[PDB]
Amino acid sequence: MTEYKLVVVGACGVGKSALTIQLIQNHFVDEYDPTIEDSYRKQVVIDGETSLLDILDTAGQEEYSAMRDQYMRTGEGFLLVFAINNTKSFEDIHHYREQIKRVKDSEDVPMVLVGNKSDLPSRTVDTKQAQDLARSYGIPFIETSAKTRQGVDDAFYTLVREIRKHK
Ligand SMILES: *CCC(=O)N1CC2(CC(n3nc(-c4ccccc4)c(-c4c(Cl)c(C)cc5[nH]ncc45)c3C)C2)C1
Ligand SMILES: Nc1nc2c(ncn2[C@@H]2O[C@H](COP(=O)(O)OP(=O)(O)O)[C@@H](O)[C@H]2O)c(=O)[nH]1
Ligand SMILES: [Mg+2]
């Protein structure tokens, strides 16, 4: 059984925890302590291959550390999450992508851009803007809602597919 180390990154409040919990416990969490950073495991079947997903839901301090570089370097694929109603969270994506490229020492790291909270009517980031950004990066873009489950399996499964292509 192949194991894939996935990491969920993005600003505070974009839905990193709710997305991870929807995949693991099949339930929408309306609150989850922003300081809890943990890894969650799930056995899935993607394209006939049984796989173990080991997902790191980043949280805690918004600060630089060499220790965090070391464990972020272990990730094989990264979900760059923003919320469709938070322009600042979209403007932060470049920052997360470049920090990941820095620790992986590569310009080619498996990533997926994720536009979360797709169920809300308060949109500030146009879908075409997110598609444009994903195209400029050469990565897939998935619209998700941790509330309704829209795109949740797609975001993680697409990331596993990106890793398979890299490997
Ligand atoms: C509200 C709590 C929450 O959900 N958080 C997510 C977050 C921001 C995450 N984070 N911030 C940094 C960072 C901070 C300052 C300078 C540079 C980076 C990182 C980070 C990343 Cl993405 C990499 C690849 C390497 C690294 N080394 N130190 C920090 C850092 C992260 C994950 C935590 C608070
Ligand atoms: N409506 C809606 N709210 C979401 C969604 N995902 C997360 N939230 C809410 O946004 C807030 C932040 O979510 P959370 O998972 O804690 O964000 P994190 O800081 O990135 O881990 C919580 O109140 C969540 O319930 C979503 O897809 N739709
Ligand atoms: Mg969280």
How is the secondary structure organized here?
Elements (H helix, E strand, L loop, with lengths): L1 E8 L6 H10 L12 E9 L2 E9 L8 H7 L4 E7 L3 H5 L1 H12 L6 E6 L10 H11 L3 E3 L8 H15 L1
Parallel strand pairs: 1-3, 1-4, 4-5, 5-6
Antiparallel strand pairs: 2-3
The structure holds the ligand *CCC(=O)N1CC2(CC(n3nc(-c4ccccc4)c(-c4c(Cl)c(C)cc5[nH]ncc45)c3C)C2)C1, guanosine-5'-diphosphate and magnesium ion.
Guanosine-5'-diphosphate (GDP) binds next to helix 1.
The appropriate CATH architecture is 3-Layer(aba) Sandwich
Going across the biggest sheet, name each strand in turn.
Answer: 2-3-1-4-5-6
CATH class: Alpha Beta
DSSP helical segment count = 6
Helical amount among residues, as a percent range?
A: 25-40%
* Annotated CATH topology: Rossmann fold
Largest pleated sheet: 6 strands, mixed
End-to-end separation:
16 Å
Would you mind describing this structure in some detail?
This protein is α/β, with parallel strands linked by helices and 167 residues long. It is 36% helix and 25% strand. It has one domain: P-loop containing nucleotide triphosphate hydrolases (Rossmann fold, 3-Layer(aba) Sandwich), CATH 3.40.50. The protein contains 6 helices and 6 strands, in the order βαββαβααβαβα. It has a 6-stranded mixed β-sheet with strand order 2-3-1-4-5-6, with helices on both faces. A hairpin with a 2-residue loop joins β2 and β3. The radius of gyration is 15 Å and the shape is globular. The two termini are 16 Å apart. The modification N-acetylmethionine is found at residue 1. It is found in: Cell membrane; Endomembrane system; Cytoplasm, Cytosol.
